[PDB]
Amino acid sequence: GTHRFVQKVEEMVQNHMTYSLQDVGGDANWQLVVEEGEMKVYRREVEENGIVLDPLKATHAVKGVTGHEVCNYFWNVDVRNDWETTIENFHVVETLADNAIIIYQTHKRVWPASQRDVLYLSVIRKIPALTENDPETWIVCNFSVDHDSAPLNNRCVRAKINVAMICQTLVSPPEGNQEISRDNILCKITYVANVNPGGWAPASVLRAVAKREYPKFLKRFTSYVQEKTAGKPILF
Ligand SMILES: CCCCCCCCCCCCCC(=O)N[C@@H](CO)C[C@@H](O)c1ccccc1
Numbered sequence: 001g002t003h004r005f006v007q008k009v010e011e012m013v014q015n016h017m018t019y020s021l022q023d024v025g026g027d028a029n030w031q032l033v034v035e036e037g038e039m040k041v042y043r044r045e046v047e048e049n050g051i052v053l054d055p056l057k058a059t060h061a062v063k064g065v066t067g068h069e070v071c072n073y074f075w076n077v078d079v080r081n082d083w084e085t086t087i088e089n090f091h092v093v094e095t096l097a098d099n100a101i102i103i104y105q106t107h108k109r110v111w112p113a114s115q116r117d118v119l120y121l122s123v124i125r126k127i128p129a130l131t132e133n134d135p136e137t138w139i140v141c142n143f144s145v146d147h148d149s150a151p152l153n154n155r156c157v158r159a160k161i162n163v164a165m166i167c168q169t170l171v172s173p174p175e176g177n178q179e180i181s182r183d184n185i186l187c188k189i190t191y192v193a194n195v196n197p198g199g200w201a202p203a204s205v206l207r208a209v210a211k212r213e214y215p216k217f218l219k220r221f222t223s224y225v226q227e228k229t230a231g232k233p234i235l236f
Pocket of ligand 1: 084086087107110116117118142159160161163193195197210213214217
């Protein structure tokens with residue numbers, strides 16, 4: 001890439017590829033707090049100076065869609081309002097490259113506290129597979145940056161985030177005369193969110209809200225991808 005954020009991008013992608021994919025089922029620092037179908041949501045309870053920082057990690061398996069398609073839909077701001085429910089307003093501050101943009105958005109008051117805004121670079125990347133026996137990996141990384149055109153606000157507390165949707169397509173070609181259809185593909189998703197609320201709020205409530213809102217998002221967003229891609233040619 002040309003843009004000034006290319007080095008930071010690579011470091012964020014690499015951290016997610018090494019630390020975010022790590023299996024969290026047997027990790028006793030993590031707690032499985034939501035299960036429904038193929039979806040599991042885990043959290044690690046962390047606070048600094050009384051501020052709840054709990055890392056969130058979800059895993060999902062979604063039939064009939066690819067990692068490329070799920071990542072495309074997650075990244076593409078032209079469809080954000082089709083699925084996102086926690087945002088009041090957003091706009092693109094800057095386009096850095098064809099796969100990378102900076103976004104400013106304000107969120108609905110889902111917490112018992114001042115309204116939050118966030119200012120993040122959103123980038124979509126493909127990580128090639130080492131062999132044709134393995135899945136290619138598609139990732140969208142959303143991470144807080146600074147921008148002159150979006151300074152701190154009077155009205156909102158500036159949250160900071162480090163989020164990744166990491167997706168891999170598994171395929172199971174059919175036995176004989178049939179061509180591959182969407183019944184033969186499944187997308188494995190890992191979604192990780194590390195959110196700094198930028199100020200204090202009761203932890204009990206913040207945790208209740210995260211337990212509610214992330215599984216809600218994931219079900220609605222993945223369903224939306226399934227609907228919008230149904231009966232379409234598969235994008236690997
Ligand atoms: C910025 C803190 C204010 C929101 C408080 C938490 C609400 C839970 C949101 C669940 C849905 C996450 C959807 C999600 O991942 N959304 C994208 C696109 O809007 C931006 C994102 O990477 C993010 C993650 C987490 C918080 C805000 C924004």
